[PDB]
Ligand binder design. Sequence first.
Ligand SMILES: CCCCCCCCCCCCO[C@@H]1O[C@H](CO)[C@@H](O[C@H]2O[C@H](CO)[C@@H](O)[C@H](O)[C@H]2O)[C@H](O)[C@H]1O
Lengths: 103, 274, 159, 486, 65, 57, 66, 55
Amino acid sequence: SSPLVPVWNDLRALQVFTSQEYMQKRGPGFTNTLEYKLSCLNPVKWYDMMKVMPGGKAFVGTALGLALFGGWGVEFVKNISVMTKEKPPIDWNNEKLGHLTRS
Amino acid sequence: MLNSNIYIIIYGGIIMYSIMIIIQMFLYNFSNKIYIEVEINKYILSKNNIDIYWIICNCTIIIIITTLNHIINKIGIYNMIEYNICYWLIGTGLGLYISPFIVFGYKFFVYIMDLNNYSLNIYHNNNKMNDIQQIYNGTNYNDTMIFFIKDINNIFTIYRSINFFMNWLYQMIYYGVRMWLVFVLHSFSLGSFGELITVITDNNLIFNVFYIGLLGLGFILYLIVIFYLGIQIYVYISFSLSFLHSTILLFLVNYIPHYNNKSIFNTFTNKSIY
Amino acid sequence: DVPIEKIPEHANVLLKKIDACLEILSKDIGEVTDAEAHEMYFETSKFQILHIYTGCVASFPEGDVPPGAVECLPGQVIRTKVNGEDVMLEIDEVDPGYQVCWFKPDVPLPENAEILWSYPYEPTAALPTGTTWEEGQANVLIPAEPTPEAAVWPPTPVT
Amino acid sequence: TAVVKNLAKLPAATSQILTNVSKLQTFHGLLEERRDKYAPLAYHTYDNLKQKTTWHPIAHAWVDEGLPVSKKEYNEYCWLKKDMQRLLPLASPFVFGIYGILPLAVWLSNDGYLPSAFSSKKDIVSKKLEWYSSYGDDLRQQVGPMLQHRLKRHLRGTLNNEHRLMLDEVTESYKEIFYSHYTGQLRDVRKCAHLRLYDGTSTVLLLTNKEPVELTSELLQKWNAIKAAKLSPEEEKKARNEALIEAYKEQELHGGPHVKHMQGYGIPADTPLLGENAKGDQYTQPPESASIPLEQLEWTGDTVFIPAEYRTEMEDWGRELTKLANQFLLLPWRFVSNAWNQRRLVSWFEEILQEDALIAKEGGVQALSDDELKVALLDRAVIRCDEELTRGDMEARYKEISWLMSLRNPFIVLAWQTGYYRSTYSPEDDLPEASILPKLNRTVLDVDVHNELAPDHPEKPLPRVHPALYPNSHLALAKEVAVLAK
Amino acid sequence: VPVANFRPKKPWDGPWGIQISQKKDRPFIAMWILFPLLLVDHLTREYYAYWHSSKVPVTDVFGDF
Amino acid sequence: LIPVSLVDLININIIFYILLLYTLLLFFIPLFLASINYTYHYIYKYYNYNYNFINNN
Amino acid sequence: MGGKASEAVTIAFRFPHRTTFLVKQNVGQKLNKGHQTFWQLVAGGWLFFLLINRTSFKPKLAAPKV
Amino acid sequence: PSTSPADKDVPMSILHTHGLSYVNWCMSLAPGLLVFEGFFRARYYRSRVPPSRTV
Ligand SMILES: CCCCCCCCCCCCO[C@@H]1O[C@H](CO)[C@@H](O[C@H]2O[C@H](CO)[C@@H](O)[C@H](O)[C@H]2O)[C@H](O)[C@H]1O
C-alpha cells in the first residue's frame, strides 16, 4: 500500500469527528426540523438505514443497489471510453422487414 | 444448416496419465503432511484448520507428484504439464486461491458485505454520535447526495470491500507465472547450451567422445535439476502460504482470553425473576 | 440378594480369567531370523559377497597386498560354513596397521601373517565342510539379554 | 410388505389425523393464552456475525409453573407436533404433481417415518415406545458416538492445538465424561458441569432507570423473600428497590459489573465532548439519568442474560455439530440454517423442562410407571432400548439429566447423553462371556446433586464419596427417603 | 446376565476391518495393471497430424454428424 | 516459444486433466483417511480411574 | 497490486459484539389484539390481485381461419 | 462422423532416427536413475539390521 494512508486516515477522522461535533453542538430538536420529517418519507434513507441492519440486510442492500443501479454504473464505466470515439450513424430500423400475412 | 453451431475441441492423453497421479498418492501417503501442519498452526488457530490443511496437502502433494513425474516419468503430458501456463494458473494457483474462501467463506462474505457499508473504524468506540451516524445516515462519513451517483458507488464500494482480498490473487498469478517462466527458460537454456556443445563436437570428432563420462555428467545434471526444481517448489509452497497468512488469514485473528467461571452448579434463568 | 461373603469367589473367578489372559500376553514375538527376510541386507552391501569355502583368511600388516589375495575390508560380507552352520560374516572394525585377505591355496602367504581361520582340502567334496573355530581361535559373544525385574503393580494396603 | 399394510389403514388414518390436529389446536390455544399473559418477551438476538438468530434456553425456554394440565396431555401435545412434522411429505404431490406419489410411497413404507394415526396402539406411551424401539433408538444409536467425537473435537480443537485450547483443570472430568466406556465406571454429573469452566461467568443484568445492576445470590434471595411475604405493592416495590440500590452500591464497590471487563461485551463510559464542545476539563457528557437521584432507583422490568459461553455457545458449534445434535435428539435437521435447528433444540429443551415440572407436580418419578419412565428417559436420550435397566437406575438417570438440564446448557447435556450410546460389538461368538455379577442397580440416593465438587487435578483423580457418608445426610436425604420407603 | 456396552453387529456398523483392508489394497492391485497400461498407451501411440496430412482424426461424440 | 501461447492458457485438455484428477481424488478420499493412529490405545491403556475405596474407620 | 489483511482491520474488530439475550416483563402488551378479520381481507386482496393478473392460454386464436 | 484417416498410418523404422547426443542422453536422467535406484534400495534394505553374534 501507499504511505499516504495515515494522511487519508487523518482526513477521514477530521470529517467524521467534525460531523459528530456539529451533531453535539446543535443538540436536541433535530426531530422537529423539516429535514428529519422529510427523511422519514425518503426511500434513500430507508435503504441506507436498512443496509446496516442485521439479518443479511447488508447483503440485501448491496445486491439491491447492484441489481438496480450498479448495472447502469458498469455501463457508465464502459461508456467513458466510448464518448470520445468516432462512431457511425445509427442504422435505425426501417420497420419494413418482418410483416407477413397469415395463412 | 443454420441451427447447427459446431465446436471443435483436440483431445489427447489425459485419462491414463491423470489416473496414476492419484494412484501415486497412496505411495507418497502425504509425506508433506507435517510441514503443512506446522505452517498452518503457525499462521492460524481455528476449528476449521484441518479443512484448509487438507486442501493444501492435496494441492501440494499433487504438485510434488507432477514435478517428479515431470523429472522422471517422461511420457506425453508429464513433460509439458510443468511447462504449461494453464497448469500453473488453474492447475495449481486457482485451488490455493479459492481454498480460504471455501474454508472461511462465511466470515469473509459477511465481512465483505459489511464493508460495502463503508465507515471509519474507531478503536475504543465509546462514542454516541458514531452510533447515530452509523444507523440513521448509514455511515460515519457524510453520505449527503451520494445517491446522486449511486450507480457507480455500489460497484466502487464492492471493490472497496474486496481490495484487501486482491493481493492474494496477484501473488498467486505472479508465482504461477514465475514457476512457468523458471521451468521453461531453464529447460530451454540448458538444452541450448547442450546443442551448442554438440555442434562444437560434431564438427570436431576428436571431441565427440564421452569426455566427462557416461554417468558423471548425467549424475551431475540430475543433481542440479532436482536441487533447483526442489528449491523452486519449496519457494512456491512456502511463499504461497506466507502470503496466504499475510493476505487472507490475518482477518481471522480473534484471540479470546480465558475467563474463569463461578456459577457452574447454578444458573440464573427467566424463572429466577419472572 | 448378594451376600458379602460371595464377593471373593467372584474375585477369584476374575483372577483366574485375567491370569489366563496375562500368561498369553506375557509372551511376545522376538526379532525375525529368517535369512530370506534379511538377504537384501547383504545384497546391498558396499562389496560383493565372498562365497568362501577354500583356502584361508589371514591378518597381516598394512601395505602392499599380495597378488591373488582377495581383500576383506570393513563392510565385506562372506558366506561360509562354520561348524556345520551356514553363516554370513560381516567385517566390522579391522584393527589399524593391519588388513585381512582371503588367500586361496594358489596364493602364497606373506611374512608376519596370522591365519585367523582356515579351510581343509576337499576338492572332490560336493558339500563342503567349511571351518571349525576352536575354543581360543575365535571369541564369540552371545548377548547377555538380562531379563529385568517383572513390572509389579503396587498393592494398596488394607488395615 | 409395510407399504400395503399402511395403505390398508390410510383411509382409517385421515380421521385420526384431523382429530389430532384439532386436539393440537385446542392445546396450543390454551398454552398460548397462558403464555401471552404469564410469560415474558424473549427478544430475538443475532449471532456475533449478525446474520442469523441465536437461541439459548435461559431466555427462550419458559416453564409455565402452574400449568393446569396432565403430563400425558402434554406428551400428546408434543408427540402430535412431531406428527405434524412427519405429515410434511403429503405436500409433495401438491408441488411436484401426480408423479409426486413415490415419495408418499417411501413415506408409507417405513412406520417410523409416519405419524401416530398409522399405529395400531392406543395409549400415547405405548405408541411412543413402539416408535422408539422400532426406529428411533436405532437411529439415535448411530449418531451418539459421532456427536460425542464432534463435541470432544470442538473442545480440544483441530490440528493438534490442544495445548492452546484445552484446560488442565477440566482434564480428569473430561476423561471421566468422555472415556468412561473404557473403564466401565459410572459418571458423576458434576464432572460434566465442570465442562462449563471452558466458558465464562454467566451474568444477569437487571436494567434500571439509572444503570444496569448485576444479579447476585443475595439480591435474588431477598427478592424471593419479599415475594413470599406477600406484601402490598407499595411495600413490595419499596423493598425491591432497597435491595436494588444496596446491590448497586455493592457492585460499584466491587469495581462495576463483571461485564465491563469481558471481551465481546462492555458498558460504555460517559460520552465524550468533541473539540470546542469540551468545556475545559469536563471532557464528558453524562447521560440524562445522571440527573435522577439514586434513591429513585427502580427496576425497569427488563433483564439481560449474558451466558459468556466463549467455547460452548451454539453459534461456534458449526454446520455439522448442530445437525448431529438434532439428529441424536430425533429432531428435524435437514436443509436449514443453524439458527432454525437452534430454535428446534431450544423448543425440545423447553418441552423437557415443562415435562419435568409436571412430573414433579404429579409426585416425582416414583409416581410414574415403568413404561412411562422408560419413555421419559428415551425422550431425554439417556437410555437405549437394548439395556433393560432397573427402576432405581432409571430414576437416578432421570434425576441426573434433570439437574443437568436445569443449568440450561445444551453442550454438557449432549456430552452426558452420548455416553449412554457407546456400545461395541465383539468379533468372536464366545466373547463377551456371560457375567457372574447381578444387574446394575442404583437409587436416587446415590446421585450427588446437593453437594459441590471441585475439579480433580490433572492425573490426580480422587475416589467417589457417597452422599450418605456426608455428615447430616439422613437429614438432607429425608425427602428422598420418604419418597422411596413409601 | 450379559456384559454391558456390548451388542451384536448391525448393518449400519459398516463392514468389518478385514473388509476395509480389502478395500484399501485395490488401488495397490490396480497399480500393477495400470502402469503397464500407461506405458502401452504411450508406446503403442501414433501422432495424429503430419505436414502431408489432408485429414485429421475426428471423433463425433454424440453422432450428430 | 511453443509454451508461450494463448491457446495453452485456457487449454480444455488440461482442464479435462484437472477434472479427471480431482474426481478421482474425491473417489479415493475414504481410502486416504484409512490410516490408523495409536492414541486411543494409549488412552485405554493409561487412563486409570481412582480405584481406592472410602474407609471412614 | 491490491491490498492485504495486514493493511486492514479484522473480522473481530468489525463484529466485535457477542450475544446478550434481552427479556422483558409481561405487562399485558400482547393482549386484546384487534382486527380479527384482517387476514381474511388480505387473502381476498391477494386472490383478487392474482385474478386481475390472470391470463388463460387461448390456443384457439391460432385456428386456421384463413 | 468419426474418422481414422490413412495419413496417420505411415512407415516406421528405428533406422531413420536422428537420435540423441551424449549431452542429451545425460539430460534424459537415465544415469541418475541408474545410481539412485541402488541408493534408495540400499538405504531401505540396510536400515533394517538383523540379529547377530559379535566375533
Ligand atoms: C542448484 C543449481 C543452480 C544452477 C541452476 C542451473 C539451471 C538448472 C535448470 C534445471 C532445469 C532444466 O530442466 C531440464 O531441462 C532439460 C533440458 O531441456 C530437459 O531435458 C530434456 O530436454 C532436452 C532438450 O534437448 C533433451 O535433449 C533431453 O534429452 C531431455 O531430457 C529436462 O527434462 C528438464 O528437467
